[PDB]
Amino acid sequence: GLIVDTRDVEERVHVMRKTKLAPTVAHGVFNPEFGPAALSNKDSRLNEGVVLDEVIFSKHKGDTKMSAEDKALFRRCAADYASRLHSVLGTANAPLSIYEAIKGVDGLDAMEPDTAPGLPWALQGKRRGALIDFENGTVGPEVEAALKLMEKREYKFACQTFLKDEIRPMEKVRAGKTRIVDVLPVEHILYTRMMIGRFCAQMHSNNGPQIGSAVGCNPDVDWQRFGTHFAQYRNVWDVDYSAFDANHCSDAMNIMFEEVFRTEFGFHPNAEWILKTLVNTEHAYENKRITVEGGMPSGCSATSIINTILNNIYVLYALRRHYEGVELDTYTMISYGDDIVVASDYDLDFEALKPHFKSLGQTITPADKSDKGFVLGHSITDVTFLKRHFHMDYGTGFYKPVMASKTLEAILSFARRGTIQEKLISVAGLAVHSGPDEYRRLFEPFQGLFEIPSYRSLYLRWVNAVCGDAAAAEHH
Ligand SMILES: [Mg+2]
Ligand SMILES: [Mg+2]
């Protein structure tokens, strides 16, 4: 987005310095070109002259203003996608109760009891457990009061900037490209869930190419569903954005919120309002208060959904701005936030769509190098989605989500202290699709030190998960 104002204030907002990630026994074996991101300016493995503060906020270069003709086209595309979206999901989008927003419903997980409250509760030394009761699903005196200000549409807030403690490629570690988590006030998260949580639960349950959303999918079981769908198209594209959510211009965001979250689709009028508060935001980093116009904060309860919705509208927009007579059935797509796979039987020229995406402030490049740009004739077994390839399991004839071995090596190389055994069981479920030989090699350093699930047990778990009938018929 656009940094419009930078102010220095009395209160200092401390950020999480020093990593919680420590190397494992696997690190010495795989030696990954990876490591924990820089969390302080004094971290010795940074490049010289790199000021972490200017780099973590360098992603704000934009807020691209759209022309009147482009804005009207964006509205038609947002209306057309919303029309499809609410045709599949339905119009049961009434506000969640305070109780249901905290405890969750079917398709929507419960709110995290101790994960940071936001501002100004962090300055006041209050944790989430003090402001809200999470077992009984009730609210304290201040959250209750903040909800009133939101109903009246006068509520204001600040986003708390957190440095994301995560494994990053060493090249990005040295460059100081630490990602940030924009922590929003817990009451704002509560209210957003109240306003659109019902909608969110319905998208999770109805995930798939029809609504263009993979949010809430289970890759183990769903890769067969997604794989078989995209396999019947002549052309498949793996499209990468550079800084997707940072570059959502305010014009795109505003029109989207207006078209998708209308009262005529069963929404409370404040659904549009609360979402619109994400457009122009104030961010608190140490002593600095940075006002940003445009872009999406990662702290909102529905960031993945919003990004996914925008991703769908963007593709419809860029195709309509280039070709004539483009409709929703001209192509098919699946997205999870910025991650995207597009397919069509038409020989669509994705290379010429570049300046049409640029009009939204977004930069599209092919995932597979700069192969003289975008090319035709690629299939779903050539693309990547959610860091997983589409490979055929020769024993069942089902598509399986296969992660690159280098990524699995990197994931197994670091862990938070005391979580290593739990992490191994989790990663084993990801690594089983790499085959028995590769699965064995990845977990060799942990042998004797931790329980490692047998390849066999995880394969048999997968077969039943993807198709119960197939596992049942196996015992013919
Ligand atoms: Mg939460
Ligand atoms: Mg947190």
Author numbering: 1 to 476
Lines quoted from the article behind this entry:
Two different crystal forms were obtained; the single mutants 3D(P44S) and 3D(P169S) incubated with sym/sub-U RNA crystallized in the tetragonal P42212 space group. The RNA molecule appeared mostly disordered in the two structures. The X-ray structures were determined to 2.2 Å and 2.6 Å resolution for 3D(P44S) and 3D(P169S), respectively, and to 2.6 Å and 2.5 Å for 3D(P44S, M296I) and 3D(SSI), respectively. P44 is conserved among known picornaviral polymerases, and it lies in a loop that connects strand β2 and helix α2 in the fingers domain. Thus, substitutions at the conserved amino acid P44 might disturb both the shape and interactions of the template channel, and the interactions with the incoming rNTP that are mediated by residues of motif F. Interestingly, the amino acid residues from M16 to K18, at the N-terminus of the enzyme, appear totally re-organized. The rearrangements in M16-K18 were also observed in the uncomplexed 3D(P44S), but with a weak electron density and higher temperature factors than the average, reflecting some degree of flexibility of this region in the absence of RNA. Thus, the structural results point at P44S as the key substitution related to reorientation of template residues that might be associated with altered RMP recognition and incorporation. The comparison of activity values in vitro suggests that amino acid P44S inflicted a cost upon 3D function. 3D(P44S) displayed undetectable incorporation of RMP opposite C in the template (<0.5% of elongated sym/sub-AC), and only a modest incorporation opposite U (5±1% of elongated sym/sub-AU).
Here we describe a new mechanism by which foot-and-mouth disease virus (FMDV) can become resistant to ribavirin. Amino acid changes in the viral polymerase, selected by ribavirin, are able to modify the types of mutations produced in the presence of ribavirin. P44S but not P169S was detected in a 70% proportion in R-Ap35, as evidenced by analysis of both the consensus sequences and their corresponding mutant spectra. These results suggest that the three substitutions in 3D were selected sequentially during replication in the presence of increasing concentrations of R: first M296I, then P44S and finally P169S. To identify possible structural modifications of the viral polymerase associated with the important alterations of the mutational spectrum in progeny RNA, and to investigate how these modifications can affect RNA binding and polymerase activity, the different mutant 3Ds were incubated with the heteropolymeric sym/sub-U RNA of sequence 5′GCAUGGGCCC3′, crystallized, and analyzed by X-ray diffraction.
